[PDB]
Amino acid sequence: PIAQIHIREGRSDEQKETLIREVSEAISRSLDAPLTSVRVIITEMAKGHFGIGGELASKVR
Amino acid sequence: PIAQIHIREGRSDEQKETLIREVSEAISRSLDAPLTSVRVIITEMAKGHFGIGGELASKVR
Amino acid sequence: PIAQIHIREGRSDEQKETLIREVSEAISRSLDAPLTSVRVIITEMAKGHFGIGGELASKVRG
Amino acid sequence: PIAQIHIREGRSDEQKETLIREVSEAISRSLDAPLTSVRVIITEMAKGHFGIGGELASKVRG
Amino acid sequence: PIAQIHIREGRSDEQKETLIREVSEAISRSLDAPLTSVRVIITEMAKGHFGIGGELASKVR
Amino acid sequence: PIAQIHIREGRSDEQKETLIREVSEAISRSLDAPLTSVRVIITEMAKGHFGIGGELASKVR
Ligand SMILES: [Cl-]
Incomplete structure (x- = not known):
């Protein structure tokens, strides 16, 4: 299996690990x-x- | 987060779920x-x- | 003999075999x-x- | 499930049943x-x- | 079908799920x-x- | 635990069992x-x- 996970940037190396x-x-x-x-x-x-929804995720959330 | 998982076909709806x-x-x-x-x-x-490795997975396993 | 079996999708390769x-x-x-x-x-x-019965099977199940 | 089975003719009702x-x-x-x-x-x-194989089954049997 | 299940309180959301x-x-x-x-x-x-049995369950298990 | 299950009618003993x-x-x-x-x-x-939905289930959908 090969998972590609898209996540918002803002996290610890540890958390991503x-x-x-x-x-x-x-x-x-x-x-x-x-x-x-x-x-x-x-x-x-x-x-x-x-x-x-056409907004930035950063804005709406 | 948005995960796209690539898997080999051949599994139950149950297992994928x-x-x-x-x-x-x-x-x-x-x-x-x-x-x-x-x-x-x-x-x-x-x-x-x-x-x-250039060869089919079914083959190479 | 040649059997063609129609089945609903959703089963393991193993089970079909x-x-x-x-x-x-x-x-x-x-x-x-x-x-x-x-x-x-x-x-x-x-x-x-x-x-x-004119409705989808998914919905009546049988 | 719906199976359609094609078989050569020539069999008893019993056997088909x-x-x-x-x-x-x-x-x-x-x-x-x-x-x-x-x-x-x-x-x-x-x-x-x-x-x-393009030949009648009755003739070649299998 | 509509199942109503009565259970003793004290369990994780996870577990009830x-x-x-x-x-x-x-x-x-x-x-x-x-x-x-x-x-x-x-x-x-x-x-x-x-x-x-007229007893609290808590008690009698 | 005590489940009460409401089901339509019309099934086997065996099935209910x-x-x-x-x-x-x-x-x-x-x-x-x-x-x-x-x-x-x-x-x-x-x-x-x-x-x-206010109609009989016999009749929905
Ligand atoms: Cl209990």
């Missing part, structure tokens, strides 16, 4: 797949690069 | 994010559409 | 026919492509 | 589906209506 | 029923509001 | 409760005794 591990375990667990086959890509979203 | 849930909870847990903000897209990979 | 095997054995057994002559085609039915 | 029952049970069993959702259609193939 | 899901699936499965049509009400029982 | 068992196990499983403590009441709804 936790995301990677937690997600990888959830994938491996629920697909009954080896952990080794699980790859996670995290793609950070700059403050003005993500929109919800 | 559990992937979605488990992954969503891992994301919302580790980012301290509302669940409501978590979106998961599952993109299935046909047997002949995913290669590992 | 069991269906194929089980059905094949039931045909061969009951017709006293060689297994080799038994062919099975599964045709999956998308969640809006199968109706019971 | 066993086919229907056996197949139905194999489907219900392997899909973990209610028996009562299982429908089987048997379509018989006349002696000159089924070909294997 | 899983009750709802599991029970819904058991109903839909065993009645061959659309899930959509399954509705579950959890009503909670305060420690002094549930009696077994 | 499965419902009871399936549900009971889902409750016991998800609450980590003893089976023995699980009670299920099933209440059947006559053809003209259940309404969805």
